[PDB]
Amino acid sequence: XXXXXXXXXXXXXXXXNITDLEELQEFQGRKRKEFEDAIRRNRLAMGHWMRYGQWELDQKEFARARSVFERALDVDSTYIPLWLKYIECEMKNRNINHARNLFDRAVTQLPRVDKLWYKYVYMEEMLGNITGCRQVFERWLKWEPDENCWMSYIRMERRYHENERARGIYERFVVVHPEVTNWLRWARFEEECGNAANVRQVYLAAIDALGQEFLNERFFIAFAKFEIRQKEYERARTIFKYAIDFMPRSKSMELYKEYTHFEKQFXXXXXXXXXXXXXXXXXXXXXXXXXXXXXXXXXXXXXXX
Amino acid sequence: XXXXXXXXXXXXXXXXXXXXXXXXXXXXXXXXXXXXXXXXXXXXXXXXXXXXXXXXXXXXXXXXXXXXXXXXXXXXXXXXXXXXXXXXXXXXXXXXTTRKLYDRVFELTPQVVVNYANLLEENAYFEDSFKIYERGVALFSYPVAFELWNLYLTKFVKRYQGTHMERTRDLFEQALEKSIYLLYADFEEKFGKAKRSISILEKAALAIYNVLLVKVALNYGVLATRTVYEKAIEXXXX
C-alpha cells in the first residue's frame, strides 16, 4: 500500500457576463491595474509585456497597444520574440506602412538577426512590389552574410523573370564567398537559360580565380557531366586528360573511374588498361605478402597489355 | 483521338484494300493516310498505330524501305518524348546502321536496353555490347542497374573468362557499389589470387554466406575452417 498512498491523495484533491457600456469600462479598467502591477513587480519579464499588448488590440487597438510594445522595447531592445509579436499585431489590423518603418528599425538596430531579414522580404511579396524587395535584399548583401541570404535573393529573380539581373547577382556571390560549390551553382542557371557557349566561359572564369590550391577534384567532373549533355567527344577527352594532372595521390581514383565511364560510351581500350593498372598499384600494400600479392596483379596487367 | 481515328484509318485503308482486290488503290490509300496525317498523345499514339498500319500494308505491298522512310520522316519530324513510344513501335521493326537510330532513344527502359545489346550480340560486336551496359548503368542507379548488371556480369565473364584479370576485377569493383560477391568469388578462385577471394568473402557484411566462406576455406585446406567459426559466432541458429 505504498504507491496507493500517493494516488489516493490526487483523486481526493481532484474531486475537490458583462452588460452596458459603463460596466465594461470598470471591468476593462481593473484588468489594466492588474497588468500595470505585474510590470512594476518585474521590470523585465517579457511574458507580462507581450500579453499586455495583445490584450489591448482585441479591446481597442492603436495607442495603448502601440505604446506598450514600444515601452517594453526600451527595457530590452534585443528580444526578438517581442519584435515579432509587435509586428504581427499591426498586420492583423492591416496597416503595412506602419510596420515597414518598424521593420527597418530592427534591421538597422541588429544586422545579424537573420529571422528579421527573411521576415522583411516575405512581407514584401504579399504586399506587392518587387523593386522594394531588391533594395532591401541588396542592403543585406552589404553585410555579406551567407549563401542562404544570396540564394533567397536569386529565387526571387527566378520566380519572376528578368534573368539578366539574376546572372549578375550570381557573379557577386562568387566574389564574396569564392568557393567551388558557388561556381557550379553559377552554371546551373545557364543550363535552364540554354546557352551552351555562355556556360563554358563561366566554367573558364572559375579556373582563373581559384588557382591550383583552391579547386576541387569534384569541379572537373561537374565540368564533364555537361559534356555528356552536349555529347561532345572533343571536349570530354581533353578535359579529363588535363584535370588528372593536378590531383595525383590526393584525389586520383575517383576521377579515373569517371574517365572510363565516358570511354564506355565512346582498338580504343588503351586507357582501360591504364586506369586499371594505376588503380592496382594505387591499392596500398602494407607488409611483404600484401605487396607481393599486388605484384601478381599489376604484372598480369602489364603482361596482357 | 485514338480508336475513332484508328478504326477510321483501318476502315479507309480497308476500303483501299477492297479497292486493291478490285484493282481500284495504293494512291488513294496514300490519300486517306494523308488524311490520317491531317488527323488531330496516346490518342496520337494510336495515330502512330495508323502510321504503323499504312507502313504495314506498305511493306506488305509488293516497298519495305520506302515506308520506313516515311515513319522515319515522322519520327524525324519529332526531332517529342511521347513520340518515343512510337519509336519503340518503329525501331522494333526498323531493324528489318540501326545503331544511331537506336541511340536517338538514349538522348530521350531497361528492357529496351538489353534488347538492343542483344542485337549487337547477335551481330557479335561483343565489346561494343559491353559498352552499352556501361551507358545504361550510369543512368538507373542501384536498383534498376542491378537488373542490368546481373546479366551483364554473367555475360562478360562468359566472354573473356580469363584473358585478363585486372579489367574484370575492376569491373566487379565498379559492380560492388549479394550474388555479386558470389560471382566474383567464383572468378577469383579459378583465375585470381585465392586468399584475396577469401578476404572478399570475409569482407561480406547471412548464415548462408558464412556457410560458403567456410566451404571455400576448407577447399584451401582444413586448418582455417576451425578458425572460421570463431569469426562465425559473432542467432542462437548460428
Instruction: Verify whether the Cβ–Cβ distance B170 to A275 is below 8 Å.
Output: yes
DSSP letter for A95, please: -
Tell me how crowded residue B156 is: count the other CB atoms within 10 A of its CB: 18
Q: A294 in contact with B at a CB cutoff of 8 Å?
A: no
Confirm if B231 and B217 have CB atoms less than 8 A apart.
no
| Chain B contact set for A276 (CB, 8 A) | 166-167, 169-170
Q: For chain A, where are the alpha helices, taking DSSP H only?
A: 4-15, 22-41, 46-59, 63-75, 80-91, 96-109, 114-127, 130-141, 147-159, 163-176, 180-193, 196-210, 218-230, 233-243, 253-265, 270-282, 289-304
- What CA–CA distance (Å, rounded) separates A85 from B38? 65
Interface test with A, best of B167, B172, B177, B195 (most A CBs within 10 A): B167
Separation of first and last alpha carbons in chain A: 87
Cell of A158: 527566378
Instruction: Verify whether the Cβ–Cβ distance B169 to A272 is below 8 Å.
Output: no
Give helix A130-141 / helix A114-127 axis angle, nearest 10°: 160
Q: Which amino acid is at A119?
A: K
Angle at B5 between CA B1 and CA B7, to 5 degrees: 135
| Chain A contact set for B174 (CB, 8 A) | 257
Tell me how crowded residue A101 is: count the other CB atoms within 10 A of its CB: 8
Local structure of A183: helix, strand or coil: helix
Tell me how crowded residue A23 is: count the other CB atoms within 10 A of its CB: 10
Cell of B87: 519509336
* Residue at grid coordinates 551567407: A146
* Residue at grid coordinates 476502315: B11
- What CA–CA distance (Å, rounded) separates B166 from A273? 8
Would you call B168 exposed, middle or buried from its count of C-beta atoms within 10 A (0-12, 13-18, 19+)? buried
| Chain A contact set for B164 (CB, 8 A) | 300-301, 304
Of the CA atoms within 13 Å of residue B20, those in its CB half-sphere come to 16
A87: nearest Cα among A114, A57, A43, A45: A57
Chain interruptions in chain B, by residue before each (C–N > 2.5 Å): 24, 40, 62, 79, 96, 108, 177, 205, 234, 236
Residues 6 or more apart whose Cβ sits within 8 Å of residue B13: B29, B32, B33, B53, B54, B57
- What CA–CA distance (Å, rounded) separates B32 from B53? 12
- What CA–CA distance (Å, rounded) separates A135 from A121? 10
Q: In Å, how far are A10, A73, A97, A140, B134 from A118, measured between CA atoms? A: 48, 21, 18, 10, 46
Of the CA atoms within 13 Å of residue A75, those in its CB half-sphere come to 18
Declared resolution, Å: 3.6
Cell of B39: 488527323
Instruction: Verify whether the Cβ–Cβ distance A276 to B193 is below 8 Å.
Output: no
- What CA–CA distance (Å, rounded) separates B170 from A259? 14
A281 to chain B, closest Cα gap in Å: 11
Would you call A26 exposed, middle or buried from its count of C-beta atoms within 10 A (0-12, 13-18, 19+)? exposed
Confirm if A170 and A154 have CB atoms less than 8 A apart.
yes
With an 8 Å Cβ cutoff, the interface of chain B facing chain A consists of 107, 127, 131, 134-135, 138, 163-167, 169-170, 173-174, 193, 195-196
| Chain A contact set for B173 (CB, 8 A) | 279
B132: nearest Cα among B106, B157, B97, B108: B106
Residues 6 or more apart whose Cβ sits within 8 Å of residue A31: A55
- What CA–CA distance (Å, rounded) separates A103 from A97? 10
A268: nearest Cα among A279, A276, A280, A260: A260
Sign of the torsion formed by the C-alpha atoms of B50, B51, B54 and B59: negative
Confirm if A239 and A220 have CB atoms less than 8 A apart.
yes
Confirm if B201 and B213 have CB atoms less than 8 A apart.
yes
Q: How far is CA B192 from the centre of its chain?
A: 30
Residues 6 or more apart whose Cβ sits within 8 Å of residue A265: A228, B131, B134, B135
A247 to chain B, closest Cα gap in Å: 21
A203: nearest Cα among A229, A265, A156: A229
Cell of A12: 481526493
Cell of A163: 534573368
DSSP letter for A88, please: H
B188: nearest Cα among B202, B200, B204: B200
Angle at B52 between CA B48 and CA B58, to 5 degrees: 145
Q: Which residue in chain A has the smallest CA separation from B175? A: A257
Tell me how crowded residue A106 is: count the other CB atoms within 10 A of its CB: 23
Q: In Å, how far are B41, B44, B87 from B94, measured between CA atoms? A: 22, 20, 9
What is the per-residue burial (b if ≥16 Cβ within 10 Å, else e) of B196-230? Answer: bbbebbeeeeeeeebeebbebbeeeeeebbeebee
A287 to chain B, closest Cα gap in Å: 15
| Chain B contact set for A296 (CB, 8 A) | 193
- What CA–CA distance (Å, rounded) separates A268 from B149? 23
3-state secondary structure chain B: CCHHHHHHHHHHHHHHHHHHHCCCCHHHHHHHHHHHHHCCCHHHHHHHHHHHHHHHHHHHCCCHHHHHHHHHHHHHHCCCCCHHHHHHHHHHHHCCCHHHHHHHHHCCCHHHHHHHHHHHHHCCCCHHHHHHHHHHHHHHHHHHHHHHHHHHHHHHHHHHCCCCHHHHHHHHHHHHCCHHHHHHHHHHHHCCCHHHHHHHHHCCCCHHHHHHHHHHHHHCCCHHHHHHHHHHHCCCCC
Give pairs for A130-138: CB < 8 Å, separation 24+: A130/A156, A130/A160
Contact pairs from chain A to chain B, CB under 8 Å: 43
- What CA–CA distance (Å, rounded) separates B169 from B188? 9
B62 to chain A, closest Cα gap in Å: 40
DSSP per residue, A217-252:
SHHHHHHHHHHHHHT-HHHHHHHHHHHTTT-TTTS-
Interface test with A, best of B149, B170, B173, B200 (most A CBs within 10 A): B170
A182: nearest Cα among A145, A139, A146, A208: A146
- What CA–CA distance (Å, rounded) separates A133 from B62? 71
Instruction: Verify whether the Cβ–Cβ distance B165 to A275 is below 8 Å.
Output: no
B48 to chain A, closest Cα gap in Å: 29
Confirm if A126 and A149 have CB atoms less than 8 A apart.
no
Confirm if A183 and A199 have CB atoms less than 8 A apart.
no
Give helix A80-91 / helix A96-109 axis angle, nearest 10°: 160
Cell of B78: 519529332
Q: Which residue in chain A has the smallest CA separation from B170? A: A276
